[PDB]
């Protein structure tokens, strides 16, 4: 990427200013629940200001920052995609359950994720990518050993390097993998993104094999969905006790968010604590809570 100059941010802001208003339209009837775009942007803007306030002068040190170059870039691109969706989605936006509208929810998550990432690679507003505290030991090794201090790497690289320890089946399996990890949708994998994945799919020992069993071949795994969407979706099995689906959490990044239907026909959502998703699923199924992955009558045998 090129250099990120003071002007650059200006544009991104103007773009952010619009994306908001568009989403401020009543017809959309957007709910407060996160992800909640109407906030993620203001907050993002806010943080960017904090950052820019601290590099106040040493602006070149920042524009130079590889990761920061990426973000703004991705961000700018992302604000646009949203703008288009509206004009090239026209009145179809206000149509709940309309492809154009689903894309909107998607981006929401990204924005939420992006913010999460940014605040991580810039706690306090001062860059700290090269020293990011990776959570699981094992993983932390692989990353610092494979990429050293790099804060963000081209998908390509990450793939090759990863394949040495964890073999990637096909060119397709990898495309799937990439979609799961690349939370900021920018063909780059950051130490932050890396951490979140490795946390969700631990143990590192069998990283991809777990992923395979919890997302590649498991009907319950739901890519980019939100709390609302999970409830909205499980509603077709609304009173088919056992029916459940899982996804990534929006507020508690790095953790799971099961969505299930209670014997008394109700939709709840739990975030596994003190027990890996692997375990939650095994027990829940045993106790009659995690029986039908997304309606499906049959359930995966994680015991393998």
């Amino acid at each position: 990427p090129g250099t990120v100059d003071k002007k650059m941010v200006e544009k991104c802001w103007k773009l952010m200013d619009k994306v908001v208003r568009l989403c401020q339209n009543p017809k959309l009837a957007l709910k407060n629940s996160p992800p909640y775009i109407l906030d993620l942007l203001p907050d993002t803007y806010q943080h960017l200001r904090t950052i820019l306030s601290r590099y106040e002068g040493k602006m070149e040190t920042l524009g130079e920052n590889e990761y920061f170059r990426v973000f703004m870039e991705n961000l700018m691109k992302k604000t646009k995609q949203t703008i288009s969706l509206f004009k090239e989605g026209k009145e179809r936006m206000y149509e709940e359950n309309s492809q154009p509208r689903r894309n909107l929810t998607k981006l929401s998550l990204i924005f939420s994720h992006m913010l999460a990432e940014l605040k991580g690679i810039f706690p306090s507003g001062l860059f700290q990518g090269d020293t990011f505290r990776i959570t699981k030991a094992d993983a932390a090794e692989f990353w610092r050993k494979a990429f050293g201090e790099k804060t963000i790497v081209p998908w390509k690289s990450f793939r090759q390097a990863l394949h040495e320890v964890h073999p990637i089946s096909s060119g397709l399996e990898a495309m799937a993998l990439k979609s799961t990890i690349d939370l900021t949708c920018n063909d780059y994998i950051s130490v932050f993104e890396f951490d979140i994945f490795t946390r969700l799919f631990q143990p590192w020992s069998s990283l991809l094999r777990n992923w395979n069993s919890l997302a590649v071949t498991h009907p319950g795994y739901m890519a980019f969905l939100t709390y609302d969407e999970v409830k909205a979706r499980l509603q077709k099995f609304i009173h088919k006790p056992g029916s459940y689906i899982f996804r990534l959490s929006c507020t508690r990044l790095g953790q799971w968010a099961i969505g299930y239907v209670t014997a008394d026909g109700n939709i709840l959502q739990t975030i596994p604590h003190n027990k890996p998703l692997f375990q939650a699923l095994i027990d829940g199924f045993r106790e009659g809570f995690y029986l039908f992955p997304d309606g499906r009558n049959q359930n995966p045998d994680l015991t393998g």
Partner: peptide
């Protein structure tokens, strides 16, 4: 804004 959404693991 704030949540409430999440429920305890039935166990």
């Amino acid at each position: 804004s704030f949540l409430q959404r999440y429920s305890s693991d039935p166990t």
